[PDB]
């Protein structure tokens, strides 16, 4: 009847601490070794680090530089503190007791885990570069690179609205940099690359910033 | 961290058998045990196997793992609805003070409709952008199923180390799937090397496309 426990703020703020602590009960501080993990919506799983309940750390290199993890043996806890934290840490977080030595039956245990997002209230303005078609001759592509915004929405008309039919635009990614970028390609036929002009209009509200590229191979 | 590599989708139609890979290094897979992880949205993982086979009490028999010299597979027989998840396989790692190293994780789909291969195209770095000092490389992936795709990126045929961010698949009208992936590079490293790859895994198919900055 081994139980771990997550707990701490399910919100928090950038450049602040990040913390969380783990109880356990119905266990021995000194029978596994105690470990934070973490999945980012998306992405895979993060093992963050492990400590011994006599202070032997050890930390994913990733991340070193910002964790301190810790161990109360009255309380019987321990705790993982993330300073530094960027929308790029808003992920899922789990206390486990690792078996490092395959020494129990019943292997690894695990606790309930607990999705810890982190709210910035800052804003940057996106960089947009051209994705040139380079002729192809046979229904060819073009798009626009929206690289290195903060908050999350940005929309991407094409010719003000004109351009519907071939427009898709890819989603955008969070970068370990804590900032977003996305790509929105149109495929337009290769005989009109020459004629037709093609500008992309991208729309960043949060930071006010509108910007037309104009797409020309 | 010498990461374990896992297939990045595996399928089948309900009630079929499904094994999942994983390829290690000699001091991860050739020194320690092997577990595997049932990974679920909004929860922790699921602990499936530890210690070559062995499960906990709860885990249902059609599940069962083995580990070889230096590879361990699961297998998923009798394939359920309820199965639906993503696969990890996790070992210890005698690196520097001790790595607890996980797989790229598997994605294991039910079959709503025929398997589609990935189509993908590649985006050199613009000109505006060599000058503002900077470099990214464009991996478009779009129109493949099961949702779940490898991109992995090669300069001079050799892989690269970092650089690399890449979505999660998702879901376009047509019930198929898409996702991107960007290479972030400094100038003097993209007029260096002879060229760089975009290299999509899915389901047993590998399309790769490579762009050079002659």
């Known amino acids: 009847q081994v139980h771990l426990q997550e707990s701490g703020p399910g919100l928090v703020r950038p450049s602040e601490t990040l913390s969380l602590t783990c109880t356990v009960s119905?266990?021995?501080?000194?029978?596994?070794?105690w470990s934070w993990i973490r999945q980012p919506p998306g992405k895979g799983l993060e093992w963050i680090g492990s400590i011994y309940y006599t202070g032997s750390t050890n930390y994913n290199p990733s991340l070193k530089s910002r964790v301190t993890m810790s161990v109360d043996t009255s309380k019987n806890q321990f705790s993982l503190r993330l300073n530094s934290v960027t929308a790029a840490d808003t992920a899922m977080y789990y206390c486990?007791?690792?078996?490092?030595?395959?020494?129990?039956?019943?292997?690894?245990?695990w606790g309930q885990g607990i999705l810890v997002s982190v709210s910035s209230a800052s804003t940057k303005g996106p960089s947009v570069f051209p994705l040139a078609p380079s002729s192809k001759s046979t229904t060819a592509a073009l798009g626009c690179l929206v690289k290195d915004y903060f908050p999350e929405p940005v929309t991407v008309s094409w010719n003000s609205g004109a351009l519907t039919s071939g427009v898709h635009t890819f989603p955008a990614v969070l970068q370990s940099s804590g900032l977003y970028s996305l790509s929105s390609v149109v495929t337009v036929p290769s005989s009109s690359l020459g004629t037709q002009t093609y500008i992309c209009n991208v729309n960043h509200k949060p930071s006010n910033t509108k910007v037309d590229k104009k797409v020309e191979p | 961290q010498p990461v374990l590599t896992q297939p990045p989708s595996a399928s089948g139609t309900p009630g079929q058998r499904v094994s999942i890979s994983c390829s290690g290094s000699r001091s991860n897979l050739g020194k320690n045990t092997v577990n595997w992880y049932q990974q679920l949205p909004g929860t922790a993982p699921k602990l499936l196997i530890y210690?070559?086979?062995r499960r906990p009490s709860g885990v249902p028999e059609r599940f069962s793992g083995s580990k070889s010299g230096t590879s361990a597979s699961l297998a998923i027989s009798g394939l359920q609805s309820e199965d639906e998840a993503d696969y990890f396989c996790?070992?210890?790692?005698?690196?520097?003070?001790?790595?607890?190293?996980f797989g790229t994780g598997t994605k294991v789909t039910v079959l709503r409709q025929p398997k589609a291969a990935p189509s993908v195209t590649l985006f050199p770095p613009s000109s505006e952008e060599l000058q503002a000092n900077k470099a990214t490389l464009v991996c478009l992936i779009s129109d493949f199923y099961p949702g779940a795709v490898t991109v992995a990126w090669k300069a001079d045929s050799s892989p690269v180390k970092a650089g690399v961010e890449t979505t999660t698949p998702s879901k376009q009208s047509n019930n198929k799937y898409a996702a991107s992936s960007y290479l972030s590079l400094t100038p003097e490293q993209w007029k260096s090397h002879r060229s760089y790859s975009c290299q999509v895994t899915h389901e047993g198919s590998t399309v790769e496309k490579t762009v050079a900055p002659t």
């Open positions: 119905d266990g021995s501080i000194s029978s596994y070794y």
């Open positions: 996790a070992a210890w790692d005698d690196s520097l003070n001790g790595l607890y190293v």
């Open positions: 210690n070559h086979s």
């Open positions: 486990a007791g690792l078996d490092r030595y395959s020494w129990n039956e019943g292997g690894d245990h």
